[PDB]
Amino acid sequence: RPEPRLITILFSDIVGFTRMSNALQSQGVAELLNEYLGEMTRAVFENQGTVDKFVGDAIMALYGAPEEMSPSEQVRRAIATARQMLVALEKLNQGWQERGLVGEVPPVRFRCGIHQGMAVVGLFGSQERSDFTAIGPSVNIAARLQEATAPNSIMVSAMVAQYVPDEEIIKREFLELKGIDEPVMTCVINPNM
Amino acid sequence: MRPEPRLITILFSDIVGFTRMSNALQSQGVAELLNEYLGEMTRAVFENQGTVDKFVGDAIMALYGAPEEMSPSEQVRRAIATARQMLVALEKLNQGWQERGLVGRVPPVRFRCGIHQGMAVVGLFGSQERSDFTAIGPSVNIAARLQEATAPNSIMVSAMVAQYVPDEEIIKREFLELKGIDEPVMTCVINPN
Numbered sequence A: 001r002p003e004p005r006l007i008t009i010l011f012s013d014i015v016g017f018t019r020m021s022n023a024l025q026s027q028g029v030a031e032l033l034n035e036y037l038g039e040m041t042r043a044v045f046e047n048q049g050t051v052d053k054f055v056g057d058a059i060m061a062l063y064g065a066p067e068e069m070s071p072s073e074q075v076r077r078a079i080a081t082a083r084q085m086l087v088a089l090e091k092l093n094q095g096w097q098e099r100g101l102v103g104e105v106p107p108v109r110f111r112c113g114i115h116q117g118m119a120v121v122g123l124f125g126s127q128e129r130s131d132f133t134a135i136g137p138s139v140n141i142a143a144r145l146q147e148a149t150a151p152n153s154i155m156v157s158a159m160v161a162q163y164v165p166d167e168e169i170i171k172r173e174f175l176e177l178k179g180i181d182e183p184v185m186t187c188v189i190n191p192n193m
Numbered sequence B: 001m002r003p004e005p006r007l008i009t010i011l012f013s014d015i016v017g018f019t020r021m022s023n024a025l026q027s028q029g030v031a032e033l034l035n036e037y038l039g040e041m042t043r044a045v046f047e048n049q050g051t052v053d054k055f056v057g058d059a060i061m062a063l064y065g066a067p068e069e070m071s072p073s074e075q076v077r078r079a080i081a082t083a084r085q086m087l088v089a090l091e092k093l094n095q096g097w098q099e100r101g102l103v104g105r106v107p108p109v110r111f112r113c114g115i116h117q118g119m120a121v122v123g124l125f126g127s128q129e130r131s132d133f134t135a136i137g138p139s140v141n142i143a144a145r146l147q148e149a150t151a152p153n154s155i156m157v158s159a160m161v162a163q164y165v166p167d168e169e170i171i172k173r174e175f176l177e178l179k180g181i182d183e184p185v186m187t188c189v190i191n192p193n
């Protein structure tokens, strides 16, 4: 049965994928995407994370579920992952650049949002089709954060930022998010430790 | 499956204001309702030869014409028939949740549906460790966005899908802005019966 517990959600999403989605065609789109994702999942698994699901060119990773994890660990790994994924993106662009797969098309950039809160975690769906995911306001914030941030940046919430030295806090500022009544305190963190 | 272009029809159903009622349902109250909702809704997709791509929270994504082949007219027809059965099935669930005191006497559960037909790269995307079957491209977004813009408990479709729908069944045609698409798109509100 799905039950509530504290977890950290991370969303990674490629910017403007739809554009290059043309003039790159089938093979191009499949080959690039499959590779992009190969690295990103690698980044998640290495940081003890869990790949909840892919949503188009987006990734949804969890920390703290299904395997119990300490609040500090949850955020520390999630951030390590976000910083790691970025390092892969710069190199993949270096791999696709000398392949022509990039360039009437720019390199690939992603938006990342991280949050920590409660969520009803467990198997959702029917007895014919059910997947393991996290449901709840907390998830929506993680998603909304990722969407509100600038390309090639990591935007966490205050809940997350508290485990982050203010020195690594590039930009603090409230922001109204879609579907969230109370304005959230967002924190754009530094890509480097 | 080896990713490749293919004409398909995409269906998105999303519950209206789910985050709002999750605060009056409590963890156990959300899992009960959400899982019951998914069972009846996916049953509808399956009994219309549709394929449940995935669940994006309280939202459902169904594909018609993939993996198994299906004609352009049948895709539209099954996808629409599915959306109409969902409403008939939701009406029943609302009665149940009515007695249970879960909702009704918290407004009764409602959902939005979006359907577009068009080319899209379908197949398995991901890594060797984790990869899933799904559709990718401009076509999927259009449906996702049409869902997003339609009034609660209404079925919105693109003009291409509308091209295979008897005229009297149309309720409202209109040039709208699809929060995610650059140029205005023509939309058609389908009669729920």
Ligand SMILES: Nc1ncnc2c1ncn2[C@@H]1O[C@H](COP(=O)(O)CP(=O)(O)OP(=O)(O)O)[C@@H](O)[C@H]1O
Pocket: A013, A014, A015, A016, A017, A018, A019, A054, A055, A056, A057, A058, B056, B061, B134, B135, B136, B137, B140, B141, B144, B145, B180
């Ligand atoms: N395979 C898939 N499964 C489910 N939803 C999908 C999907 N592919 C796309 N979508 C949904 O379609 C909508 C638009 O997709 P996006 O990937 O955000 C367009 P984009 O070209 O990448 O621009 P953007 O991400 O910079 O905004 C989103 O709501 C996304 O979640």
Ligand SMILES: Nc1ncnc2c1ncn2[C@@H]1O[C@H](COP(=O)(O)CP(=O)(O)OP(=O)(O)O)[C@@H](O)[C@H]1O
Pocket: A055, A060, A133, A134, A135, A136, A139, A140, A143, A144, A179, B014, B015, B016, B017, B018, B019, B020, B055, B056, B057, B058, B059
């Ligand atoms: N389990 C999950 N997996 C992936 N994305 C999820 C998710 N739960 C929520 N989201 C994402 O969080 C965002 C908002 O969730 P919503 O479905 O809109 C809650 P809502 O209160 O019902 O808003 P609504 O009334 O506009 O439908 C979406 O982009 C959705 O894809």
Ligand SMILES: [Ca+2]
Pocket: A013, A014, A015, A016, A017, A056, A057, A058
């Ligand atoms: Ca994207």
Ligand SMILES: [Ca+2]
Pocket: B014, B015, B016, B017, B018, B058, B059
């Ligand atoms: Ca919803």
Ligand SMILES: [Mg+2]
Pocket: A013, A147
């Ligand atoms: Mg996006």
Ligand SMILES: [Mg+2]
Pocket: B014, B148
């Ligand atoms: Mg929504």
